[PDB]
Protein backbone atom coordinates (compact mmCIF):
# COMPACT_ATOMS: atom_id res chain seq x y z
CA UNK A 1 0.00 0.00 0.00
CA UNK A 2 0.96 3.68 0.17
CA UNK A 3 3.82 4.65 2.45
CA UNK A 4 1.46 5.93 5.20
CA UNK A 5 -1.72 3.81 5.37
CA UNK A 6 -4.89 5.97 5.41
CA UNK A 7 -6.99 3.24 7.05
CA UNK A 8 -6.22 0.18 9.14
CA UNK A 9 -8.58 -2.66 10.21
CA UNK A 10 -7.13 -2.24 13.71
CA UNK A 11 -8.00 1.43 14.34
CA UNK A 12 -11.11 0.16 16.13
CA UNK A 13 -8.80 -1.29 18.80
CA UNK A 14 -7.36 2.15 19.66
CA UNK A 15 -8.37 3.11 23.20
CA UNK A 16 -8.98 6.70 24.39
CA UNK A 17 -6.16 8.78 25.84
CA UNK A 18 -5.88 8.22 29.61
CA UNK A 19 -6.53 11.18 31.88
CA UNK A 20 -2.81 11.21 32.73
CA UNK A 21 -2.03 12.30 29.18
CA UNK A 22 1.25 11.36 27.54
CA UNK A 23 4.88 11.83 28.59
CA UNK A 24 7.25 11.86 25.60
CA UNK A 25 10.20 11.67 28.02
CA UNK A 26 8.85 8.55 29.75
CA UNK A 27 11.31 5.62 29.81
CA UNK A 28 10.80 2.02 28.74
CA UNK A 29 8.90 0.02 31.34
CA UNK A 30 11.27 -2.96 31.18
CA UNK A 31 14.67 -1.35 30.58
CA UNK A 32 14.32 2.39 31.31
CA UNK A 33 15.68 3.42 27.89
CA UNK A 34 15.09 7.05 26.87
CA UNK A 35 16.41 6.73 23.30
CA UNK A 36 13.86 4.96 21.03
CA UNK A 37 10.45 4.47 22.67
CA UNK A 38 6.91 3.66 21.54
CA UNK A 39 3.47 4.02 23.12
CA UNK A 40 0.75 1.37 23.12
CA UNK A 41 -2.40 3.11 21.90
CA UNK A 42 -4.39 0.34 23.64
CA UNK A 43 -2.87 0.37 27.15
CA UNK A 44 -0.51 3.38 26.83
CA UNK A 45 2.45 1.61 28.35
CA UNK A 46 5.86 2.68 27.05
CA UNK A 47 8.48 0.26 25.75
CA UNK A 48 11.62 0.71 23.68
CA UNK A 49 11.90 0.20 19.94
CA UNK A 50 12.95 -2.79 17.89
CA UNK A 51 16.66 -1.95 17.71
CA UNK A 52 17.01 -1.14 21.42
CA UNK A 53 15.77 -4.39 22.97
CA UNK A 54 12.49 -5.13 21.17
CA UNK A 55 10.41 -4.53 24.31
CA UNK A 56 7.46 -2.93 22.52
CA UNK A 57 7.53 -5.81 20.03
CA UNK A 58 7.52 -8.26 22.94
CA UNK A 59 4.59 -6.34 24.40
CA UNK A 60 2.61 -6.72 21.17
CA UNK A 61 3.47 -10.42 21.13
CA UNK A 62 1.97 -10.96 24.59
CA UNK A 63 -0.91 -8.47 24.74
CA UNK A 64 -1.94 -8.41 21.07
CA UNK A 65 -2.25 -4.62 20.92
CA UNK A 66 -1.90 -3.57 17.26
CA UNK A 67 -1.00 0.12 17.12
CA UNK A 68 1.81 2.12 18.70
CA UNK A 69 2.95 5.76 18.59
CA UNK A 70 6.66 6.59 18.33
CA UNK A 71 8.03 9.17 20.76
CA UNK A 72 10.80 9.82 18.19
CA UNK A 73 8.66 11.08 15.28
CA UNK A 74 5.06 10.44 16.48
CA UNK A 75 4.41 7.84 13.77
CA UNK A 76 1.75 5.15 14.15
CA UNK A 77 2.87 1.60 13.39
CA UNK A 78 0.55 -1.40 13.12
CA UNK A 79 2.36 -4.63 13.95
CA UNK A 80 -0.30 -6.63 12.10
CA UNK A 81 -0.51 -4.53 8.94
CA UNK A 82 3.27 -4.14 9.27
CA UNK A 83 3.05 -0.56 8.01
CA UNK A 84 2.63 3.02 9.17
CA UNK A 85 -0.94 4.29 9.58
CA UNK A 86 -2.61 7.71 9.69
CA UNK A 87 -6.31 8.46 10.11
CA UNK A 88 -8.74 10.87 11.76
CA UNK A 89 -8.97 8.60 14.82
CA UNK A 90 -5.21 8.66 15.42
CA UNK A 91 -5.12 12.41 14.76
CA UNK A 92 -6.23 13.30 18.31
CA UNK A 93 -3.71 11.38 20.43
CA UNK A 94 -0.93 12.82 18.25
CA UNK A 95 -1.69 16.31 19.62
CA UNK A 96 -1.44 15.27 23.28
CA UNK A 97 2.07 14.02 22.51
CA UNK A 98 2.85 17.05 20.33
CA UNK A 99 1.71 19.67 22.85
CA UNK A 100 3.65 17.69 25.48
CA UNK A 101 6.65 17.58 23.17
CA UNK A 102 6.86 20.88 21.23
CA UNK A 103 4.37 22.97 23.22
CA UNK A 104 2.37 23.61 20.05
CA UNK A 105 -0.34 22.08 17.88
CA UNK A 106 0.21 19.81 14.86
CA UNK A 107 -0.49 21.35 11.42
Amino acid sequence: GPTPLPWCPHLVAVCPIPAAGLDVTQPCGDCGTIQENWVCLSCYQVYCGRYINGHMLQHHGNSGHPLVLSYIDLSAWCYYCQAYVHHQALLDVKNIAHQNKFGEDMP
Binding site: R50, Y51, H60, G61, Y84
Partner: protein, 160 residues
Protein backbone atom coordinates in the same frame (compact mmCIF):
# COMPACT_ATOMS: atom_id res chain seq x y z
CA UNK B 1 9.73 -27.52 23.24
CA UNK B 2 13.47 -27.21 22.58
CA UNK B 3 13.13 -24.21 20.27
CA UNK B 4 11.72 -22.24 23.19
CA UNK B 5 14.79 -22.99 25.31
CA UNK B 6 17.27 -22.48 22.48
CA UNK B 7 15.93 -18.99 21.80
CA UNK B 8 16.61 -18.13 25.45
CA UNK B 9 20.09 -19.68 25.41
CA UNK B 10 20.98 -17.33 22.54
CA UNK B 11 19.68 -14.18 24.25
CA UNK B 12 21.37 -15.04 27.56
CA UNK B 13 24.73 -15.79 25.92
CA UNK B 14 24.76 -19.37 27.22
CA UNK B 15 27.33 -20.77 24.82
CA UNK B 16 26.90 -23.98 26.82
CA UNK B 17 23.11 -24.42 26.68
CA UNK B 18 23.21 -23.57 22.96
CA UNK B 19 25.51 -26.54 22.38
CA UNK B 20 23.25 -28.69 24.59
CA UNK B 21 19.80 -27.92 23.20
CA UNK B 22 21.09 -27.77 19.62
CA UNK B 23 22.87 -31.10 20.12
CA UNK B 24 19.66 -32.71 21.43
CA UNK B 25 17.97 -31.82 18.12
CA UNK B 26 16.66 -28.35 18.99
CA UNK B 27 15.60 -26.67 15.76
CA UNK B 28 18.45 -24.37 14.75
CA UNK B 29 15.91 -22.25 12.82
CA UNK B 30 13.46 -22.18 15.73
CA UNK B 31 10.84 -19.43 15.88
CA UNK B 32 9.15 -17.36 18.51
CA UNK B 33 5.71 -15.99 17.69
CA UNK B 34 7.31 -12.82 16.29
CA UNK B 35 9.67 -14.68 13.93
CA UNK B 36 12.84 -14.06 15.97
CA UNK B 37 15.29 -16.94 15.50
CA UNK B 38 18.27 -17.83 17.70
CA UNK B 39 20.49 -16.10 15.14
CA UNK B 40 18.64 -12.79 15.53
CA UNK B 41 19.17 -13.02 19.29
CA UNK B 42 22.89 -13.80 19.02
CA UNK B 43 23.46 -10.92 16.60
CA UNK B 44 21.36 -8.48 18.63
CA UNK B 45 23.16 -9.14 21.93
CA UNK B 46 26.65 -9.54 20.47
CA UNK B 47 27.46 -13.22 21.05
CA UNK B 48 29.96 -13.78 18.24
CA UNK B 49 30.49 -17.42 19.20
CA UNK B 50 26.78 -18.25 19.24
CA UNK B 51 26.43 -16.56 15.85
CA UNK B 52 29.23 -18.73 14.45
CA UNK B 53 27.87 -22.03 15.82
CA UNK B 54 24.32 -21.23 14.69
CA UNK B 55 25.51 -20.39 11.17
CA UNK B 56 27.66 -23.53 11.03
CA UNK B 57 24.64 -25.69 11.93
CA UNK B 58 22.51 -24.17 9.16
CA UNK B 59 20.94 -21.06 10.68
CA UNK B 60 19.16 -19.06 8.00
CA UNK B 61 21.39 -15.99 7.71
CA UNK B 62 18.62 -13.96 6.02
CA UNK B 63 15.76 -14.96 8.32
CA UNK B 64 13.29 -12.20 9.22
CA UNK B 65 10.86 -11.17 11.97
CA UNK B 66 7.40 -9.56 12.09
CA UNK B 67 9.09 -6.23 11.33
CA UNK B 68 11.46 -7.45 8.61
CA UNK B 69 14.69 -7.16 10.61
CA UNK B 70 17.46 -9.59 9.67
CA UNK B 71 20.40 -10.51 11.91
CA UNK B 72 22.52 -8.04 9.94
CA UNK B 73 20.07 -5.21 10.69
CA UNK B 74 20.61 -5.97 14.38
CA UNK B 75 24.40 -6.41 14.46
CA UNK B 76 24.72 -3.26 12.34
CA UNK B 77 22.44 -1.24 14.62
CA UNK B 78 24.16 -2.36 17.84
CA UNK B 79 27.68 -1.93 16.46
CA UNK B 80 28.84 -5.57 16.42
CA UNK B 81 31.40 -5.17 13.65
CA UNK B 82 32.72 -8.72 14.08
CA UNK B 83 29.26 -10.27 13.73
CA UNK B 84 28.49 -7.94 10.81
CA UNK B 85 31.50 -9.34 8.93
CA UNK B 86 30.58 -12.93 9.82
CA UNK B 87 27.00 -12.46 8.60
CA UNK B 88 28.07 -10.66 5.41
CA UNK B 89 30.61 -13.40 4.71
CA UNK B 90 27.86 -15.96 5.38
CA UNK B 91 25.78 -14.35 2.60
CA UNK B 92 23.67 -11.75 4.42
CA UNK B 93 21.89 -9.35 2.07
CA UNK B 94 23.74 -6.07 2.58
CA UNK B 95 20.78 -4.04 1.26
CA UNK B 96 18.00 -6.00 2.98
CA UNK B 97 15.10 -3.77 3.99
CA UNK B 98 12.80 -3.90 7.00
CA UNK B 99 9.10 -3.08 6.85
CA UNK B 100 9.96 0.49 7.90
CA UNK B 101 12.36 0.91 4.96
CA UNK B 102 15.63 0.69 6.90
CA UNK B 103 18.67 -1.07 5.44
CA UNK B 104 21.66 -2.04 7.59
CA UNK B 105 23.38 1.08 6.26
CA UNK B 106 20.49 3.23 7.54
CA UNK B 107 20.88 1.78 11.04
CA UNK B 108 24.69 1.86 11.16
CA UNK B 109 24.68 5.50 10.05
CA UNK B 110 21.86 6.46 12.44
CA UNK B 111 23.70 4.84 15.36
CA UNK B 112 27.14 6.36 14.77
CA UNK B 113 29.06 3.18 13.87
CA UNK B 114 31.65 4.58 11.48
CA UNK B 115 33.48 1.27 11.01
CA UNK B 116 30.44 -0.82 10.02
CA UNK B 117 29.41 1.84 7.49
CA UNK B 118 32.57 1.37 5.40
CA UNK B 119 32.35 -2.42 5.69
CA UNK B 120 28.76 -2.31 4.41
CA UNK B 121 29.81 0.04 1.60
CA UNK B 122 32.58 -2.42 0.68
CA UNK B 123 29.93 -5.18 0.45
CA UNK B 124 27.73 -3.19 -1.93
CA UNK B 125 25.44 -1.19 0.36
CA UNK B 126 23.09 1.18 -1.47
CA UNK B 127 23.96 4.68 -0.24
CA UNK B 128 20.81 6.00 -1.97
CA UNK B 129 18.28 3.63 -0.38
CA UNK B 130 15.34 5.31 1.34
CA UNK B 131 12.95 4.51 4.18
CA UNK B 132 9.18 5.00 3.94
CA UNK B 133 9.60 8.74 4.58
CA UNK B 134 12.32 9.07 1.93
CA UNK B 135 15.37 9.43 4.18
CA UNK B 136 18.77 8.11 3.10
CA UNK B 137 21.51 6.80 5.40
CA UNK B 138 23.08 10.22 4.87
CA UNK B 139 19.90 11.93 6.12
CA UNK B 140 19.79 9.78 9.26
CA UNK B 141 23.46 10.44 10.08
CA UNK B 142 22.91 14.21 9.90
CA UNK B 143 19.76 14.27 12.03
CA UNK B 144 21.44 12.24 14.80
CA UNK B 145 24.66 14.23 15.14
CA UNK B 146 27.10 11.88 13.39
CA UNK B 147 28.99 14.29 11.14
CA UNK B 148 31.78 11.88 10.23
CA UNK B 149 29.52 9.14 8.84
CA UNK B 150 27.59 11.77 6.86
CA UNK B 151 30.77 12.93 5.11
CA UNK B 152 31.67 9.37 4.09
CA UNK B 153 28.19 8.61 2.75
CA UNK B 154 28.28 11.94 0.91
CA UNK B 155 31.64 11.31 -0.78
CA UNK B 156 30.53 7.77 -1.69
CA UNK B 157 27.44 9.18 -3.40
CA UNK B 158 29.41 11.86 -5.28
CA UNK B 159 31.83 9.33 -6.82
CA UNK B 160 31.58 10.04 -10.48
Amino acid sequence: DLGKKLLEAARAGQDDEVRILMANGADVNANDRNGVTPLHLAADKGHLEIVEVLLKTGADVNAIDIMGATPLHLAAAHGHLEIVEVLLKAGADVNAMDHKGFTPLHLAAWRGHLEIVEVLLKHGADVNAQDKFGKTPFDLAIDNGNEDIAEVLQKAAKLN
